Amino acid sequence: PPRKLVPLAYKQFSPNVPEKTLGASGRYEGKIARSSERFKELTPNYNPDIIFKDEENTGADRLMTQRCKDRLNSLAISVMNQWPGVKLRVTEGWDEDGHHSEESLHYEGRAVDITTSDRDRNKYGLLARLAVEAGFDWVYYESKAHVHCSVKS
Amino acid sequence: PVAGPYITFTDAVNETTIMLKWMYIPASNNNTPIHGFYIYYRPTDSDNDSDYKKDMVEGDKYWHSISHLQPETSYDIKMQCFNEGGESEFSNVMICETKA
Ligand SMILES: [Ca+2]
Ligand SMILES: [Ca+2]
Ligand SMILES: [Zn+2]
C-alpha cells in the first residue's frame, strides 16, 4: 500500500548539508579504477527488480558498495510498493567513463543516478523522498533527468 | 580498427548543442589509417541502442560540436574510429546535458 510522502523539490538535498560532510556521505577517499586495490570492494548488484541502463555494456552500473547495495535494494521494494507496475531504474553507478566532476562519489561506487522505469519525471520528487527513507546517506534532486543518491564509507 | 578513441571532455555549448573532444593512439591499432570518426548520441531517457543518432567527422580533428539537440535534455554520447575495413569498438560512454 503506497504511502503519502513529501516530495523533494528540484535541486533540493537531504540531509540539508553538502554531500561531503560527516552528516551526509563523508569525504572523498580516492578514485577507484579497475586496477585499484579497492576495486575489489565493489560488488555487482544483480537484483531482478532493478533496471540498469548499462549503456556502456560493461555492467559498470551494477558495481557499488555493500552499503549502497543495501540502501538500493530496499528502495527497489519501496518503488514497486509505491507505483505497482513501476520499477527502480539506475542510470549511473560506479563510473570509469569520467564525465563526473573530480572527487565524485560515483568514482567510488558510493553513488547512483536513479529514475523511474517509465521516466515519469512527475514521480522524481517522491522518488527522492523514498531514497531518503531507504537509508541513503545523501539524496539530491540533481537534475530533471535523474535523482542523486550516495552512502558513507 | 579494434581499439576506439577516448572521449576526454564533453560539455553544453548552449540550449541545442554539445561540444566534445577526444584522443586516439594507433600502434594499438598497428598504425592503420583512419578515415574519420562516428559520433553517436541518444536521449538518456532511452536504453535501446537503436535510438542512437550518428555524426561523421574526419580523422584530422580531435573535437566536434553536436547540433540540433533538444533544450534541457540529457544525452548519452559515445564514438568510434573507422577506415575502409569497418568501425572500431565504441569509446567510453559520456553523459552530458544541454542548457535550460
Ligand atoms: Ca551508465
Ligand atoms: Ca558511466
Ligand atoms: Zn550524479
Side-chain angles (χ1 to χ4, degrees):
Chain A
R3 47 197 301 193
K4 69 166 182 179
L5 290 168
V6 272
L8 287 200
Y10 174 62
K11 285 289 186 183
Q12 175 189 354
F13 47 96
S14 180
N16 188 16
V17 284
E19 179 185 44
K20 301 302 167 52
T21 53
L22 285 187
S25 299
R27 295 191 180 188
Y28 183 73
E29 298 176 353
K31 176 153 40 196
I32 300 179
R34 296 190 180 278
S35 53
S36 303
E37 166 163 336
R38 273 166 71 240
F39 176 93
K40 297 74 196 179
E41 303 192 349
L42 297 182
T43 46
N45 192 340
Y46 277 111
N47 192 339
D49 299 305
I50 306 183
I51 286 181
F52 287 89
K53 183 178 179 55
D54 187 30
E55 77 284 358
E56 311 99 329
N57 298 305
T58 68
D61 291 353
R62 309 183 165 275
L63 285 180
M64 56 192 67
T65 68
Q66 196 63 43
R67 185 182 183 85
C68 188
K69 186 169 175 172
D70 298 348
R71 278 54 175 162
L72 193 72
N73 277 353
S74 72
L75 177 52
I77 309 171
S78 201
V79 172
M80 307 174 66
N81 184 70
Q82 189 71 36
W83 307 285
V86 174
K87 290 186 174 175
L88 170 66
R89 175 171 169 260
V90 171
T91 60
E92 280 286 321
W94 171 79
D95 177 35
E96 64 164 346
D97 291 287
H99 64 269
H100 297 276
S101 58
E102 293 174 6
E103 301 202 36
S104 184
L105 287 192
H106 281 283
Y107 297 125
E108 308 193 5
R110 278 206 283 146
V112 280
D113 286 342
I114 58 178
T115 74
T116 275
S117 56
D118 66 17
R119 277 58 141 263
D120 183 12
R121 295 177 175 186
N122 304 304
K123 285 181 167 68
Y124 288 21
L126 293 172
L127 180 56
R129 178 54 69 182
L130 285 179
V132 170
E133 300 198 318
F136 275 100
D137 293 335
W138 204 66
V139 179
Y140 170 50
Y141 203 140
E142 171 168 315
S143 163
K144 292 298 186 63
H146 73 255
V147 173
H148 181 84
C149 303
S150 67
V151 291
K152 277 184 295 184
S153 177
Chain B
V2 263
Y6 186 66
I7 315 184
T8 295
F9 284 108
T10 68
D11 195 31
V13 176
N14 54 71
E15 303 80 15
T16 59
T17 137
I18 299 178
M19 168 93 66
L20 79 141
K21 309 192 167 191
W22 66 90
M23 77 179 309
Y24 169 80
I25 66 285
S28 68
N29 289 335
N30 293 343
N31 276 23
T32 50
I34 293 203
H35 308 128
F37 305 97
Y38 288 120
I39 286 77
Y40 294 87
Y41 49 113
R42 173 192 59 183
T44 305
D45 280 355
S46 167
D47 297 352
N48 201 325
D49 295 341
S50 309
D51 295 355
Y52 277 105
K53 200 167 56 178
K54 170 189 312 171
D55 279 4
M56 273 199 56
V57 291
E58 35 185 343
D60 285 352
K61 33 192 53 174
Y62 64 99
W63 65 279
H64 174 74
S65 298
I66 305 178
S67 43
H68 292 69
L69 296 183
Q70 218 55 40
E72 202 165 353
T73 297
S74 181
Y75 285 91
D76 309 334
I77 301 169
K78 60 179 175 184
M79 66 174 296
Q80 52 186 188
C81 58
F82 71 86
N83 53 36
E84 303 180 351
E87 310 87 54
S88 72
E89 286 187 345
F90 292 106
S91 69
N92 53 322
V93 187
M94 307 275 293
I95 296 181
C96 195
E97 210 163 334
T98 56
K99 290 197 168 186

mmCIF file of all heavy atoms in Angstrom, chain A residues 55-56 60-61 91-92 94-100, chain B residues 93 95, ligand 2:
data_model
loop_
_atom_site.group_PDB
_atom_site.id
_atom_site.type_symbol
_atom_site.label_atom_id
_atom_site.label_comp_id
_atom_site.label_asym_id
_atom_site.label_seq_id
_atom_site.Cartn_x
_atom_site.Cartn_y
_atom_site.Cartn_z
ATOM 1 N N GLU A 55 24.461 1.451 -20.558
ATOM 2 C CA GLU A 55 24.660 1.844 -21.946
ATOM 3 C C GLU A 55 26.115 1.649 -22.353
ATOM 4 O O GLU A 55 26.461 1.769 -23.528
ATOM 5 C CB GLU A 55 24.228 3.295 -22.178
ATOM 6 C CG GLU A 55 25.213 4.337 -21.678
ATOM 7 C CD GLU A 55 25.173 4.511 -20.177
ATOM 8 O OE1 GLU A 55 24.347 3.847 -19.523
ATOM 9 O OE2 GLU A 55 25.968 5.317 -19.651
ATOM 10 N N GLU A 56 26.961 1.341 -21.374
ATOM 11 C CA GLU A 56 28.372 1.079 -21.632
ATOM 12 C C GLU A 56 28.601 -0.365 -22.062
ATOM 13 O O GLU A 56 29.603 -0.675 -22.705
ATOM 14 C CB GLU A 56 29.214 1.374 -20.392
ATOM 15 C CG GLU A 56 28.943 2.717 -19.750
ATOM 16 C CD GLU A 56 28.026 2.614 -18.551
ATOM 17 O OE1 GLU A 56 27.156 1.718 -18.530
ATOM 18 O OE2 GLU A 56 28.185 3.429 -17.622
ATOM 19 N N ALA A 60 29.046 -1.746 -15.518
ATOM 20 C CA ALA A 60 29.670 -0.898 -14.509
ATOM 21 C C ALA A 60 28.638 -0.359 -13.526
ATOM 22 O O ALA A 60 28.928 -0.183 -12.343
ATOM 23 C CB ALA A 60 30.424 0.245 -15.168
ATOM 24 N N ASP A 61 27.432 -0.100 -14.024
ATOM 25 C CA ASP A 61 26.361 0.458 -13.206
ATOM 26 C C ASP A 61 26.022 -0.430 -12.019
ATOM 27 O O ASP A 61 25.679 0.061 -10.945
ATOM 28 C CB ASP A 61 25.109 0.683 -14.048
ATOM 29 C CG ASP A 61 25.279 1.796 -15.050
ATOM 30 O OD1 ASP A 61 26.324 2.478 -14.996
ATOM 31 O OD2 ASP A 61 24.372 1.992 -15.886
ATOM 32 N N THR A 91 20.774 4.776 -13.795
ATOM 33 C CA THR A 91 21.428 5.322 -14.979
ATOM 34 C C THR A 91 22.931 5.440 -14.772
ATOM 35 O O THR A 91 23.687 5.513 -15.734
ATOM 36 C CB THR A 91 20.872 6.711 -15.350
ATOM 37 O OG1 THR A 91 21.085 7.619 -14.263
ATOM 38 C CG2 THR A 91 19.387 6.631 -15.649
ATOM 39 N N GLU A 92 23.356 5.464 -13.514
ATOM 40 C CA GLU A 92 24.770 5.588 -13.183
ATOM 41 C C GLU A 92 25.079 4.984 -11.820
ATOM 42 O O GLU A 92 24.462 5.345 -10.821
ATOM 43 C CB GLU A 92 25.199 7.056 -13.191
ATOM 44 C CG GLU A 92 25.466 7.626 -14.569
ATOM 45 C CD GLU A 92 26.763 7.123 -15.165
ATOM 46 O OE1 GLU A 92 27.750 6.985 -14.413
ATOM 47 O OE2 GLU A 92 26.799 6.875 -16.389
ATOM 48 N N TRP A 94 28.852 2.966 -10.116
ATOM 49 C CA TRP A 94 30.280 3.234 -10.166
ATOM 50 C C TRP A 94 30.611 3.673 -11.586
ATOM 51 O O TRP A 94 29.973 3.225 -12.538
ATOM 52 C CB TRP A 94 31.079 1.987 -9.791
ATOM 53 C CG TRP A 94 32.546 2.130 -10.033
ATOM 54 C CD1 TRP A 94 33.448 2.785 -9.246
ATOM 55 C CD2 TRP A 94 33.288 1.604 -11.140
ATOM 56 N NE1 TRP A 94 34.704 2.702 -9.796
ATOM 57 C CE2 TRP A 94 34.633 1.981 -10.959
ATOM 58 C CE3 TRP A 94 32.945 0.851 -12.268
ATOM 59 C CZ2 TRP A 94 35.635 1.632 -11.862
ATOM 60 C CZ3 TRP A 94 33.940 0.506 -13.164
ATOM 61 C CH2 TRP A 94 35.268 0.896 -12.955
ATOM 62 N N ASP A 95 31.597 4.551 -11.735
ATOM 63 C CA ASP A 95 31.908 5.100 -13.051
ATOM 64 C C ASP A 95 33.391 5.066 -13.402
ATOM 65 O O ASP A 95 34.252 5.288 -12.549
ATOM 66 C CB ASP A 95 31.389 6.533 -13.167
ATOM 67 C CG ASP A 95 31.759 7.177 -14.485
ATOM 68 O OD1 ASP A 95 31.794 6.462 -15.506
ATOM 69 O OD2 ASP A 95 32.017 8.398 -14.504
ATOM 70 N N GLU A 96 33.678 4.790 -14.671
ATOM 71 C CA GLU A 96 35.040 4.859 -15.189
ATOM 72 C C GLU A 96 35.073 5.517 -16.566
ATOM 73 O O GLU A 96 36.072 5.439 -17.278
ATOM 74 C CB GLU A 96 35.672 3.467 -15.254
ATOM 75 C CG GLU A 96 34.985 2.513 -16.210
ATOM 76 C CD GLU A 96 35.841 1.304 -16.532
ATOM 77 O OE1 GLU A 96 37.053 1.338 -16.230
ATOM 78 O OE2 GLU A 96 35.303 0.323 -17.090
ATOM 79 N N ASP A 97 33.971 6.162 -16.935
ATOM 80 C CA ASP A 97 33.882 6.886 -18.200
ATOM 81 C C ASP A 97 34.406 8.309 -18.033
ATOM 82 O O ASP A 97 35.039 8.854 -18.937
ATOM 83 C CB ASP A 97 32.442 6.891 -18.719
ATOM 84 C CG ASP A 97 31.981 5.514 -19.165
ATOM 85 O OD1 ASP A 97 32.429 5.052 -20.234
ATOM 86 O OD2 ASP A 97 31.167 4.894 -18.450
ATOM 87 N N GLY A 98 34.132 8.909 -16.877
ATOM 88 C CA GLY A 98 34.802 10.132 -16.467
ATOM 89 C C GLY A 98 34.142 11.464 -16.772
ATOM 90 O O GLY A 98 34.830 12.476 -16.897
ATOM 91 N N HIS A 99 32.818 11.484 -16.878
ATOM 92 C CA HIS A 99 32.106 12.734 -17.129
ATOM 93 C C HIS A 99 31.630 13.382 -15.830
ATOM 94 O O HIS A 99 30.872 14.352 -15.853
ATOM 95 C CB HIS A 99 30.922 12.508 -18.069
ATOM 96 C CG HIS A 99 29.867 11.608 -17.507
ATOM 97 N ND1 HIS A 99 29.875 10.243 -17.697
ATOM 98 C CD2 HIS A 99 28.770 11.878 -16.761
ATOM 99 C CE1 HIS A 99 28.830 9.711 -17.091
ATOM 100 N NE2 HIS A 99 28.142 10.680 -16.516
ATOM 101 N N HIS A 100 32.078 12.843 -14.701
ATOM 102 C CA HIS A 100 31.696 13.370 -13.395
ATOM 103 C C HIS A 100 32.769 14.289 -12.817
ATOM 104 O O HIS A 100 33.966 14.042 -12.980
ATOM 105 C CB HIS A 100 31.410 12.229 -12.418
ATOM 106 C CG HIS A 100 30.260 11.361 -12.822
ATOM 107 N ND1 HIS A 100 28.951 11.676 -12.531
ATOM 108 C CD2 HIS A 100 30.223 10.186 -13.493
ATOM 109 C CE1 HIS A 100 28.157 10.735 -13.008
ATOM 110 N NE2 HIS A 100 28.905 9.818 -13.596
ATOM 111 N N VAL B 93 31.431 5.811 -22.762
ATOM 112 C CA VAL B 93 30.161 6.499 -22.970
ATOM 113 C C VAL B 93 29.989 7.644 -21.978
ATOM 114 O O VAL B 93 29.969 7.434 -20.765
ATOM 115 C CB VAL B 93 28.963 5.538 -22.867
ATOM 116 C CG1 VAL B 93 27.680 6.256 -23.254
ATOM 117 C CG2 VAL B 93 29.181 4.325 -23.755
ATOM 118 N N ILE B 95 27.874 10.964 -20.439
ATOM 119 C CA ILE B 95 26.536 11.516 -20.275
ATOM 120 C C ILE B 95 26.610 13.027 -20.092
ATOM 121 O O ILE B 95 27.135 13.511 -19.089
ATOM 122 C CB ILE B 95 25.812 10.901 -19.062
ATOM 123 C CG1 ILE B 95 25.580 9.404 -19.282
ATOM 124 C CG2 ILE B 95 24.496 11.620 -18.804
ATOM 125 C CD1 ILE B 95 24.848 8.724 -18.144
HETATM 126 CA CA CA C 2 29.368 5.716 -16.514
#
